[PDB]
Amino acid sequence: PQAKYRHDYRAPDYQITDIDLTFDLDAQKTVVTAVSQAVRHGASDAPLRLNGEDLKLVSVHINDEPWTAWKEEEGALVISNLPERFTLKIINEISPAANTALEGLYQSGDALCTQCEAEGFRHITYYLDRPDVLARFTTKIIADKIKYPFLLSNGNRVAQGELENGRHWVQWQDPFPKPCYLFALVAGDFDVLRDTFTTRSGREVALELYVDRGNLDRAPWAMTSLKNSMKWDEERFGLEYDLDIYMIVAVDFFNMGAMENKGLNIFNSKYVLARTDTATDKDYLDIERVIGHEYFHNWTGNRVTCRDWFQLSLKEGLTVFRDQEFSSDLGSRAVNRINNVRTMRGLQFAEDASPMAHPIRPDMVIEMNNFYTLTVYEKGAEVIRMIHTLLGEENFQKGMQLYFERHDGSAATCDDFVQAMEDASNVDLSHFRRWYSQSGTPIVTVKDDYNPETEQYTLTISQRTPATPDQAEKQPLHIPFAIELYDNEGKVIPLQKGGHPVNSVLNVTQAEQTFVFDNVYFQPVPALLCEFSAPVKLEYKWSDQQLTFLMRHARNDFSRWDAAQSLLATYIKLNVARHQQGQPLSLPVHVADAFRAVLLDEKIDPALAAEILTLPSVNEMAELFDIIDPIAIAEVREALTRTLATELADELLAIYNANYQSEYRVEHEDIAKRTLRNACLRFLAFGETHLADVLVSKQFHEANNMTDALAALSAAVAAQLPCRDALMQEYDDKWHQNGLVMDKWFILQATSPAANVLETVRGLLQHRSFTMSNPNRIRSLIGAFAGSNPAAFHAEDGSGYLFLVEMLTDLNSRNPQVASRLIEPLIRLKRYDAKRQEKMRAALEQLKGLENLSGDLYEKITKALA
Numbered sequence: 001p002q003a004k005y006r007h008d009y010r011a012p013d014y015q016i017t018d019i020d021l022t023f024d025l026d027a028q029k030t031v032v033t034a035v036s037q038a039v040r041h042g043a044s045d046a047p048l049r050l051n052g053e054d055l056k057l058v059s060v061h062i063n064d065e066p067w068t069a070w071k072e073e074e075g076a077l078v079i080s081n082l083p084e085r086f087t088l089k090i091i092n093e094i095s096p097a098a099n100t101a102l103e104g105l106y107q108s109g110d111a112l113c114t115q116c117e118a119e120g121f122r123h124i125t126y127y128l129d130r131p132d133v134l135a136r137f138t139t140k141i142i143a144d145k146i147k148y149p150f151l152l153s154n155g156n157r158v159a160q161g162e163l164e165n166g167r168h169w170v171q172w173q174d175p176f177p178k179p180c181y182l183f184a185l186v187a188g189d190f191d192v193l194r195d196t197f198t199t200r201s202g203r204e205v206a207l208e209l210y211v212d213r214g215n216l217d218r219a220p221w222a223m224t225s226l227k228n229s230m231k232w233d234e235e236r237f238g239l240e241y242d243l244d245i246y247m248i249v250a251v252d253f254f255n256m257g258a259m260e261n262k263g264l265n266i267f268n269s270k271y272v273l274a275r276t277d278t279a280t281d282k283d284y285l286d287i288e289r290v291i292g293h294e295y296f297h298n299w300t301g302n303r304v305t306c307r308d309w310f311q312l313s314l315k316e317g318l319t320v321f322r323d324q325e326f327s328s329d330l331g332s333r334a335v336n337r338i339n340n341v342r343t344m345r346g347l348q349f350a351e352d353a354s355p356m357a358h359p360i361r362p363d364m365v366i367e368m369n370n371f372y373t374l375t376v377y378e379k380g381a382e383v384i385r386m387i388h389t390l391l392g393e394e395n396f397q398k399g400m401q402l403y404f405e406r407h408d409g410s411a412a413t414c415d416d417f418v419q420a421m422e423d424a425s426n427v428d429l430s431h432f433r434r435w436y437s438q439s440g441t442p443i444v445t446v447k448d449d450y451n452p453e454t455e456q457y458t459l460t461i462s463q464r465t466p467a468t469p470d471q472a473e474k475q476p477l478h479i480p481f482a483i484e485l486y487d488n489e490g491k492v493i494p495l496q497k498g499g500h501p502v503n504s505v506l507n508v509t510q511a512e513q514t515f516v517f518d519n520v521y522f523q524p525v526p527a528l529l530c531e532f533s534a535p536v537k538l539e540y541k542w543s544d545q546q547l548t549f550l551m552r553h554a555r556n557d558f559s560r561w562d563a564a565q566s567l568l569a570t571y572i573k574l575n576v577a578r579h580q581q582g583q584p585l586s587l588p589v590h591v592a593d594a595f596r597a598v599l600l601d602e603k604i605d606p607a608l609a610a611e612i613l614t615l616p617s618v619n620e621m622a623e624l625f626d627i628i629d630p631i632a633i634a635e636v637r638e639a640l641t642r643t644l645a646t647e648l649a650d651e652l653l654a655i656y657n658a659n660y661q662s663e664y665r666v667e668h669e670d671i672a673k674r675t676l677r678n679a680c681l682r683f684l685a686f687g688e689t690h691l692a693d694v695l696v697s698k699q700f701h702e703a704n705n706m707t708d709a710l711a712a713l714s715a716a717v718a719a720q721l722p723c724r725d726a727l728m729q730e731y732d733d734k735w736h737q738n739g740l741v742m743d744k745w746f747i748l749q750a751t752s753p754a755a756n757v758l759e760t761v762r763g764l765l766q767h768r769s770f771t772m773s774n775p776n777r778i779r780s781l782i783g784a785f786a787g788s789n790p791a792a793f794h795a796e797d798g799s800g801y802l803f804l805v806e807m808l809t810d811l812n813s814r815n816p817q818v819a820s821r822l823i824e825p826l827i828r829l830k831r832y833d834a835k836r837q838e839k840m841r842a843a844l845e846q847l848k849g850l851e852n853l854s855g856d857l858y859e860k861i862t863k864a865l866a
């Protein structure tokens with residue numbers, strides 16, 4: 001498989017303006033007829049190359065004349081000797097039942113449905129399967145009426161008929177030109193939740209949400225979220241929906257989370273179905289997030305699309321920013337910000353330090369499905385948020401407005417987006433662009449000095465981005481660096497210089513730079529990189545007391561949490577070294593004191609309290625070290641949890657009981673009390689054993705919702721309490737016929753601290769509720785083991801590596817996309833010790849050797865083994 005390069009982009013030799021598809025649907029053999037109106041822009045001797053994969057070509061016509069001047073190559077149909085304008089007709093055959101990779105047209109349970117991003121449309125017919133070719137689609141679908149009563153595609157339903165032999169047909173017309181990655185088709189039998197939304201402007205939009213028969217009771221929260229999404233995009237961005245129907249379909253078998261197909265979103269059902277006894281607060285808020293995300297794509301993705309796949313972040317970074325703003329506006333801004341930063345530092349930093357490291361705009365791709373990443377998405381969003389930080393909200397919106405004005409109806413580039421923001425705002429983003437072309441995490445170093453003679457405070461800030469496997473050259477970035485300075489009573493000291501105030505977002509543009517501030521009437525405590533103003537690692541020599549000060553006094557809740565993280569980091573690193581030398585936890589008293597203070601602070605927002613009392617994950621902790629000792633990390637996390645549970649036992653139990661709520665609401669104040677409560681429970685599970693087993697058992701049984709029942713079940717697993725096995729059997733017994741609920745249980749099983757966890761996970765491959773045919777199940781069991789049980793995945797004997805190789809040997813042939821997702825923990829070998837590398841290297845070489853090795857895996861394996 002050969003790599004493609006962004007610098008090689010060039011405009012297509014042909015365009016397609018309109019395509020009329022007829023599908024004669026059957027799960028064994030589907031016949032596709034595709035009539036495309038085409039135009040040659042290039043030279044007469046340039047043939048038309050149509051992408052296609054796994055199609056059985058039946059016929060080729062040009063202006064109705066059967067065509068003799070064409071050849072099939074690997075992945076293409078190359079057609080010669082064409083006129084300047086003409087009607088291409090292709091008839092071909094495909095086979096949804098065979099399609100286990102879940103790419104193109106395929107079978108989800110009894111339904112048929114599509115996935116065309118990034119390059120799945122070429123698995124349905126021969127086409128210009130590149131997102132700078134935009135066309136007007138009409139889609140005619142013919143099928144068995146009993147099997148497939150509902151026949152859906154993008155746009156509006158314009159025609160319909162009955163046929164002989166119990167068949168019927170429906171036709172759809174989507175008036176907006178689109179690249180083919182945005183095509184969808186769905187056939188099957190569903191319950192439908194129908195409702196409507198009226199835009200600011202008076203357009204009445206039919207909303208229709210399709211779910212498997214029996215599941216209508218778990219649809220209204222999605223429906224409600226869609227309406228909140230539409231309303232918010234109006235209020236915040238001035239954007240209204242542009243069609244008359246908005247369809248969403250929930251399918252069980254889906255590689256991604258969900259898909260923004262124009263007017264017909266297809267969703268993994270984990271991001272639609274909720275009921276208080278099946279779904280946690282996290283689930284409700286994730287459904288809100290993803291619904292919004294796909295809805296926001298209607299403009300930042302669909303009405304403006306990507307010129308080529310190297311511009312993926314132009315829609316995803318931006319659309320992620322939008323979902324984060326949505327979720328933040330409607331909920332707790334601070335809790336969303338905190339969580340998003342945990343994700344950035346805890347997972348994405350890891351990716352930017354891996355052999356898969358890339359810029360948010362990649363320069364080289366082998367399999368474009370490997371580039372739907374933490375970097376492109378999350379770091380992408382942080383890049384958008386930096387622009388926002390530099391422009392302020394008003395100029396940002398002006399920029400948005402210019403972007404649409406210039407590019408509505410076409411495919412654009414990341415550079416285009418940046419130029420609109422610059423032009424609209426008059427802020428120079430030349431240097432800022434480097435964020436799009438450079439990979440890796442910059443490290444910002446801050447040294448400071450107070451001068452009491454002159455009442456001045458000097459920050460000396462420097463930056464470097466270490467080399468990455470992909471890029472030997474790095475240069476300084478335009479890094480927006482937000483500060484606040486606190487006096488000894490916790491009041492903010494006005495930033496100023498030479499009698500004029502200074503903006504608190506510093507422009508750190510050079511390798512090294514000094515900032516001087518006047519009228520600093522007291523030696524300040526700084527808050528640095530406020531609200532994570534740039535996606536960088538901060539290096540500053542805090543005292544413990546500067547940090548607890550900030551936890552007490554900082555104006556922004558994020559800063560208070562962030563300070564706690566820095567306080568902990570220090571002692572997480574201490575104790576990992578202590579573990580390695582056979583020593584127990586050490587923790588100064590004043591650290592535990594700081595967390596007592598949080599627990600008992602009467603005025604603190606419980607949303608914040610809960611995050612501060614949520615210890616960094618094992619993945620977050622791992623970014624504190626160049627070489628990860630996954631066993632030491634896991635053990636220290638536990639031991640820190642044990643130590644705090646004992647120091648703070650009385651406090652924890654009190655706060656636990658005080659936040660009891662008899663009523664369940666999906667409401668932001670209730671969620672926060674409940675999140676704090678369950679944080680308290682977690683520590684208590686690691687306390688006196690009998691009281692632990694009682695509290696946890698009790699909650700499991702008394703819970704009137706899944707948030708509380710799972711918090712308890714999860715504590716029972718994590719602390720290994722006597723009630724564990726019995727509680728896990730109750731859950732299995734009650735929930736085994738429900739896959740999305742069981743995923744929760746598989747995740748617990750996979751992430752268990754128990755010594756025989758791998759043996760359990762292997763057996764669970766035969767569990768009644770598991771199946772290798774479903775991505776959600778694969779990920780909940782196998783992926784969670786590999787990815788979220790590092791202590792066991794990295795058992796010193798190599799059993800984890802071997803397990804994953806076995807599973808990947810399957811998935812490489814069955815579903816390469818899920819395979820590539822699952823390989824990721826193996827690609828990180830250079831962060832582990834030599835003996836572990838050698839085993840992981842060997843595992844990777846074994847995979848490299850597989851017969852039909854997928855391009856999805858090849859790209860990652862070869863990068864890892866360089």
Ligand code: NA
Pocket residue numbers: 015016017133134135
């Ligand atoms: Na076109």
Ligand code: NA
Pocket residue numbers: 328329330331332333
């Ligand atoms: Na808010």
Ligand code: NA
Pocket residue numbers: 447448449450
């Ligand atoms: Na200093």
Ligand code: NA
Pocket residue numbers: 346347350618619620622623
């Ligand atoms: Na990590």
Ligand SMILES: [Zn+2]
Pocket residue numbers: 293297315316319
């Ligand atoms: Zn997206």
